[PDB]
C-alpha cells in the first residue's frame, strides 16, 4: 500500500520574529498531531501596536502522514 | 507568542447573493467553532439552472484562535 | 461524454456585485444554452463624481457543448 | 501631452456587506482626492465577533488621474 | 437553509502515476468522509530514488457537504 | 510578419483519467476548428459519486491559427 | 446601458517587436469585431530561429461591448 | 541606520508604445520625486478607439529612497 | 462601517537579517505615520557584495487607519 | 549536512501521456545528474497535429543535492 | 516519442527599450547555446539614474532542445 | 551591455531563515562569480520529532554573465 498525507493550515505567532513564530506554531501542532513531516509558509504578517511589531504572524501549511 | 490560529476552508452558499453566501457559511461555522476571528474570500462561483444563478457559492478561509 | 466551453464576460450594474453578476449571466442566457456554472475573475468599477457609476464583474462562464 | 495615473490602495469597511464596504471606502477617498477614475478589488475579508461578521473589509486599488 | 461545504487538503501518492495517486488519496478520504463532491489538484510532485520516480504525489483540495 | 492566433478555453472530461479527459476535449475541438496548434492545462478537477471519481475534468486553453 | 462586455483571447505576432505584435493582433480583431474597448497583455513570448527572434508573440485579452 | 524604500504605483500612458508609456509615467514621477531607483511593470493594457490603440497604459511599481 | 484603512508599500533593509529588515522599515514608518495596524511581507530579496548578503530587503505592505 | 540543493527546469515529452512525459524528462536528467530528490510540475502543455496530441509536454522543476 | 527541453532564466538589458533588452539577452544565449526554441518574459524591470531609465531589464525563461 | 543569469537553489539551516539564506548563497559563492542579488521563492522545512530539523529557503540568484 501507499501513504496519504493531510495538509492543515495554522498561524504561528511570536513577538520576536519569523523563526520563533514558525516554531511557536509547529509546537502547538506537535502537542496533538503525530507524523508531522513538512511545512510551507503561506504568508508573513504582523500586528502593530504603538508603531511596533506586537506579534509576528506566519501562516503555514503543515503536512503530516495519515494513520489508518 | 503563545497564541496559535487554525485556518479552515469552507464554501458558504445562498440563492440570494454573495453576502448571503458568506454569512450562511460563517453561521454554520459558528454553530460548532469558537473564537472565530476573521475570514478571507478565496473565490466566488455559482451553479446555474434555467439560465440563472441557483446558488451563489463563496469559498472562504476562516481563522480561529486555538484553545489549549 | 461531455465537453464544456468556458467564455469570459463582464456583467455590469450600478447597484452592486450581485446585480452585475446577474446582469451579465442574463445576457449570456439570451443566446447560450446549457449554462452550468460561473467563476468571478475580478471585481472592478468605474467612478464618476467620486462614486461608483458601475460595478463590473468579470466572469468565466461554463456551458456544455452541443454536438 | 498624455495623462499619468496614480494607484493607491485602501480598505473600505461596512457591517452590511461587500458593496457597502467598497462604497464606504471610496467615499472617504473622494473627500480629499479628485479625478477618481476606477477601482479594483484586491481582497474581501472580515473580522468576526461572537461568530458574526462585525465588519466586511474590501481592499481596493484606486486609480485617479494625476494633476500637474 | 442551503448547504455549506468543507474543503480539506490531502496528498494522494502512488508509484504508478498521476491518476492512481489521485484515486489513492480520495480512497483514503472516502474511508471516513461522507458526501464527497469534488476535488481540485493543487500541485503534482514526486520523490525520486536512484534516478527514477518512487512516488507520484498529487496535492488535492477536496470538498464535501457538511452535515448538521 | 503576419499570423494571429486565437485562444479558447474548454474542459475535456473522461471517467478514465487526466490524459483521456485531455484527448476527449481536444477531439471535440478538432471536429469544428482548424489549424489547432497547442494546448495548456489550466486545472485538473473532478466530480465524485459516493466516494469515487465519476469524471476527471481538465480545463484547457487551446490555441489555433486564425484564417483570414 | 448596464452593458455587458465580452473578453476574448488572441496572440498578436510580429518580427519587429512587442508593440508591433500587439497592434498586429488588434488589427485582426478589428477586421471583424465592433466596439473594441480595451486589451490586457497576458504574456510576452516568442519563437527563436538561428538564435534570433523570428516572431514576437503577445497574448492579449480583448474586451468589447456586446450588442443586443 | 540603513535605508528604507517607498514603493508607489502609477500608470504611464502613450499612443506610441510600451517604452514611451513607461518613460512617460516615470517622467511625471521624476518631476516631484527624488532618489528614484527602480521600477517594475505590473501590467500592460490599453484603450482602443475605432479599432486601433489610442493609448498604451503601463502600470508600474516605482521605488525610491526615503529621506529622513 | 465608518473606518477606512490605507495600505502603503515599503522596503525595509538591514545587513543583519529578515526580521531586522522588517523592523527597520516599520520603524521609519512609525516616525511619521500614526495608528499603524498591520503589515504583510510581499517579498524577500537582497543585494550581494563580495559573495555575501550586503543588505536584506523585505518589501512590506503596511496598513493604517485613516484619520478624518 | 546543511546541504544545498539545486533546482533546474526541464520539459519532458511523450506522445503517450502526462505520466510518460514526466518520466521521459526525468530519465534524461538521470543520465547526467546525481542525487536527484524531487520534481514539481510547472505546467502541462502539448503540440497538436491533424487535430490530435502529437506530444504531451510536462514542464518540471527538478531538485537535486549539490555535491562539494 | 522522445525529446527533452531545458529551460534556463536570464535577464537581457538595454538602455533603448524592452525589445532591445530582449534581443540583447537572447544574443548572449545564442553565443553558447544551440537549438534555442522559445522565450517567455517573466518580468520587465529597470534601474533609474537621476529620474531617467538607465537600463531596461527583461527577465526571460529560454527553452532549448537538449542534445543527447 | 550586461546579461544576467538567474539560477535556483535551496539553502538549508537548522537555525533559521537567515542562516538558510546565507548557507545557500555561500555554496553558490564557492563556484560562481559576480553574484549580484537574490529573491526568496519559498520558505519550507522538514519536521522531525515535531520540531524543525531544517529551514529550507528556495532562492533565485542573479549573477552577471561573463563573455
Ligand atoms: C478542533 C481542532 C482545532 C482541535 O485540534 P487540537 O486541539 O490541536 O487537537 P485535536 O483535538 O484535533 O486532536 C488530534 C486528533 O487527531 C488525531 N491524530 C493525531 N495525529 C494524527 C495523524 N497522524 N493521523 C491521524 N490522526 C491523528 C489524534 O488522535 C486526535 O484524534 P481524536 O480526537 O479522535 O482522539 C482541530 O481538530 C480542527 O480544527 N478540526 C477541524 C474542525 C473543522 O473542520 N471545523 C468545522 C467547522 S464548519
Ligand atoms: C468533520 C467536520 C466536518 C465536523 O465539523 P462540525 O460539524 O462543524 O463540528 P466538529 O465535529 O468538528 O466539532 C467542533 C470541534 O472543535 C472543537 N473546538 C471548537 N472551537 C475550538 C477552538 N476555538 N479551539 C480548539 N477547539 C475548538 C470542539 O470541541 C469540537 O471538538 P470535539 O467534537 O472533538 O469535542 C470537521 O471537524 C472536519 O471537516 N474535520 C475533519 C476533516 C478531515 O480532515 N478529515 C480527514 C479525511 S482524509
Ligand atoms: C497621509 C494620507 C493618508 C492623507 O490622505 P487624506 O487625508 O485622505 O488626504 P490628503 O491629506 O493626502 O489630501 C489630498 C492631497 O492630494 C491632493 N490631490 C487630490 N487629488 C489629486 C489629484 N487628482 N492629483 C494630484 N493631487 C491631488 C490634494 O490637493 C491634497 O494635496 P495637499 O495636501 O498638498 O494640499 C495620504 O496622503 C497618504 O497615505 N500619503 C502617503 C504617506 C506615505 O507614503 N507614508 C510614508 C511613511 S514611510
Ligand atoms: C485527525 C484526522 C487526520 C483524522 O482523519 P480521518 O482518520 O480520515 O477521519 P476522522 O477520524 O477525522 O473522522 C471523520 C469525522 O468526520 C465526520 N464526518 C464524516 N463526513 C462528514 C460530513 N460529510 N459532514 C459532517 N461530519 C462528517 C465523521 O463522523 C467523523 O467524526 P467523529 O470522529 O467525531 O466520529 C483529520 O480528522 C484531521 O486532519 N482533522 C484536523 C486536525 C487538525 O486540524 N489539527 C489541529 C492541530 S493544530
Ligand atoms: C457556439 C460554440 C460553442 C460552437 O462551437 P462549435 O460547435 O464547436 O464550432 P462552431 O459552430 O462555432 O464552428 C466553428 C466555426 O469557426 C470556423 N473556424 C474553424 N477554424 C477556424 C480558423 N482557424 N480560422 C477562422 N475560422 C475558423 C469554422 O469554419 C466555423 O465557422 P462557420 O460555421 O461560420 O463557417 C462556439 O463557437 C463558441 O463558444 N462561440 C462563442 C460563444 C460566445 O462567445 N457567446 C457569447 C455569449 S454572451
Ligand atoms: C471562428 C472565429 C475564429 C472567427 O472569427 P473572425 O473571423 O475574426 O470573425 P467572425 O467570423 O466570428 O465574425 C465576427 C462575428 O462577431 C459579430 N460581432 C462583431 N462585433 C460584435 C459585437 N460587438 N457584439 C455582437 N456581435 C458582434 C459579427 O456579427 C460576426 O458574426 P456574424 O458572422 O454572425 O455576422 C471566431 O469567431 C472564434 O474563435 N469563435 C469561437 C470558436 C469556438 O469557441 N470554438 C469552440 C470549439 S469547441
Ligand atoms: C497627492 C499626489 C497625487 C501628488 O503627487 P505629486 O504631484 O506627484 O507630488 P507631491 O505633491 O506629492 O510632492 C512629493 C512630496 O514628496 C516629497 N519627496 C520627494 N521625494 C522624496 C523622497 N525621496 N523622500 C522623502 N520625501 C520626498 C516632496 O518634498 C513632496 O513633499 P511636500 O509636498 O510636502 O513638499 C501624491 O502625493 C499621492 O498620490 N499621495 C498619496 C495620496 C493618498 O494616499 N490619498 C489618500 C486618500 S484615502
Ligand atoms: C513623500 C513621502 C515619502 C514622505 O513620507 P514621510 O517622510 O514618511 O512623512 P510624510 O511627509 O508623508 O508625513 C506624514 C503625513 O501623514 C499624515 N498622517 C500620519 N498618520 C496619519 C493617519 N493615520 N491618517 C491620516 N493622516 C496621517 C501626517 O499628518 C502627515 O501629513 P502632512 O505632512 O501633510 O501634515 C510620502 O508621503 C509619500 O511617498 N507620499 C507621496 C508619494 C506619491 O504618491 N508621489 C506621487 C509621485 S507621481
Ligand atoms: C549544457 C547542459 C544542457 C548539458 O547538460 P547534460 O548533458 O544533461 O549534463 P552535463 O553535460 O551538464 O553534465 C552534468 C554535470 O553535472 C555534474 N553533476 C551531476 N550531478 C551533480 C550534483 N549532484 N552535484 C554537483 N555536480 C553534479 C557532473 O559532474 C557534470 O559535470 P562535468 O561535465 O563537469 O562532469 C546543461 O548542463 C545546462 O543546461 N547547463 C546550463 C546552461 C546555461 O545556463 N547556459 C547559459 C546561457 S546564457
Ligand atoms: C556557467 C554559465 C553561466 C556559463 O554559460 P555560458 O558561458 O553562456 O555557456 P557555457 O560555458 O555553459 O557553454 C554552454 C555549454 O552547453 C552546451 N550546450 C549548448 N547547447 C546544448 C544543447 N542544446 N544540448 C546539450 N548541450 C548544449 C555547450 O556545448 C557547452 O558545453 P561544453 O562547453 O561543456 O562543451 C552557465 O553554464 C550556467 O549558468 N550554468 C549553471 C551554473 C550553476 O547552476 N551553478 C551552481 C552554483 S550553486
Ligand atoms: C460576437 C459574439 C459575442 C456574439 O454573441 P451573442 O450575440 O451573445 O450570441 P451568438 O450570436 O454567438 O449566438 C449564439 C451561438 O451559439 C450557439 N449555441 C448556443 N448554445 C450553445 C451550446 N450550448 N453549444 C453549442 N452551441 C451553442 C447558437 O446556436 C449560436 O450559433 P449560431 O449563430 O450559428 O446559430 C460571438 O458569440 C463571439 O464573441 N464569438 C467569438 C468572437 C471571436 O472569437 N472573434 C475573433 C476576433 S479575432
Ligand atoms: C552540476 C552543477 C550544479 C555544478 O555546480 P557547481 O559545482 O556549484 O559549480 P560548477 O561546477 O558549475 O562551476 C562553475 C562554472 O561556472 C563558471 N562561472 C562562474 N561564474 C561565472 C559567471 N559569472 N559567468 C560565466 N561563467 C561563470 C565557472 O568557470 C565554472 O565553469 P567551468 O566548470 O567550465 O570552469 C552545475 O553548475 C549545474 O547545476 N548545471 C546545470 C545542470 C543541468 O542543466 N543539467 C541538465 C540535466 S537534464
Ligand atoms: C512548454 C513549451 C512552451 C512552448 N512555448 C512556445 C512559445 O511560446 N512560442 C513558440 O513559438 N513555440 C513554443 N513552444 C514550441 C517549441 O518551440 C517547440 O518545442 C519547437 O519549436 C520544436 O522544435 P525542435 O525540433 O527543436 O524540438 C513551446 C513548447 C513547449 C514544450
Ligand atoms: C503563446 C504561444 C504559446 C505556445 N505554446 C506552445 C506549446 O505549449 N507547445 C508547443 O508545442 N508549441 C507552442 N507554441 C507554438 C505554436 O504551436 C506555433 O505557433 C505553431 O506550431 C506554428 O504553426 P502555424 O503555422 O500553424 O502557425 C506556442 C506559441 C505561442 C505564440
Ligand atoms: Cl490553499
Ligand atoms: Cl500590489
Give an account of the 3D structure.
- 12 copies of one chain form a homododecamer.
- The first copy, chain A, has 68 residues and is an alpha+beta fold.
- Chain A has one domain: Flavin-binding protein dodecin (Dodecin subunit-like).
- Chain A is built from 1 helix and 3 strands, in the order E-H-E-E.
- The A-I interface holds A 16-19, 43-48, 51-53, 56 and I 18-19, 22-23, 26-27, 29-30, 33, 36-41, 62.
- Bound molecules: coenzyme A (12 copies), flavin mononucleotide (FMN) (2 copies) and chloride ion (CL) (2 copies).
- One flavin mononucleotide (FMN) sits between chains F (3, 5, 35, 37-38, 40, 63, 65) and G (11, 45, 57, 59).
- Chains A, B, D, E, F, G, H, I, J, K: CoA 1 binds at residues 6, 28, 32-34, 65, 67.
- Chains A, B, D, E, F, G, H, I, J, K: It comes from Mycobacterium tuberculosis (strain CDC 1551 / Oshkosh).
Q: CATH topology of chain A, which one? A: Dodecin subunit-like
The CATH homologous superfamily name of chain A equals Flavin-binding protein dodecin
- Helical stretch tally of chain A: 1
Structural class of chain A: alpha+beta
Instruction: Please report the distance between the alpha carbons of the first and last residues of chain A.
Output: 12 Å
CATH architecture field of chain A? 2-Layer Sandwich
Q: Any idea of the CATH class of chain A?
A: Alpha Beta
Bound molecules: coenzyme A, flavin mononucleotide, chloride ion
Q: What assembly state would you assign to the polypeptide chains in this entry?
A: homododecamer
Our Rg estimate of chain A from Cα atoms comes to: 14 Å
What's the main sheet of chain A like? 3 strands, antiparallel
Q: Looking at the structure, what is the overall shape of chain A?
A: elongated
Arrangement of strands in the largest sheet of chain A: 1-3-2
* SSE pattern of chain A: EHEE
What fraction, in percent, of the residue positions of chain A are helical? 10-25%
Please provide the count of β strands of chain A: 3
Largest interface: A-I, 14 and 16 residues
The overall number of domains of chain A is 1
Strand content of chain A: over 45%
